[PDB]
Design a protein around this ligand. Sequence first.
Ligand SMILES: OC[C@H]1O[C@H](Oc2ccc(-c3c(F)c(F)c(F)c(F)c3F)cc2)[C@@H](O)[C@@H](O)[C@@H]1O
Length: 158
Amino acid sequence: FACKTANGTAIPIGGGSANVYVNLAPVVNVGQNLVVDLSTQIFCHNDYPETITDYVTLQRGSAYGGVLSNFSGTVKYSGSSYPFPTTSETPRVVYNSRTDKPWPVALYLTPVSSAGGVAIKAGSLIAVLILRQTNNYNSDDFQFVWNIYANNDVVVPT
Ligand SMILES: OC[C@H]1O[C@H](Oc2ccc(-c3c(F)c(F)c(F)c(F)c3F)cc2)[C@@H](O)[C@@H](O)[C@@H]1O
């Protein structure tokens, strides 16, 4: 089991950490959602699916910078929504293909009334998402750390 980003940065077998720089909707009005869809940014595969089934959870998701202070929201993992920042590890998703497939994670964030104009600053850390991988084969328990950075400013107009 291993993963890569959209620009080709890999976290190999055994886990690790990587930085992910995502483009964000530059304008989010009150009432709208800011969607940070990592399923187009993070991909993973199973290295021997005929014998081994890989299990993959979102173990923890933390918010930082303007996402912490200016938004309220949730994380959607494989069709289910949970609080964000997370309070517990999600259920497992099955990976059973050698073809790199998306990690189905997305943040759904809406501005709080006290949000400031410049809600997210370009280049800032906005989230840390931990992918935890196990299997039905041995005792492997590996954490893939995804550090999410904003590519651009996000403004919430009045
Ligand atoms: O994604 C599958 C596994 O890939 C790595 O662990 C491997 C253990 C065994 C084999 C393997 C196998 F199971 C076979 F049946 C083979 F024929 C073979 F050549 C293999 F290399 C490949 C990867 C780790 O990330 C682990 O954590 C993961 O579960």
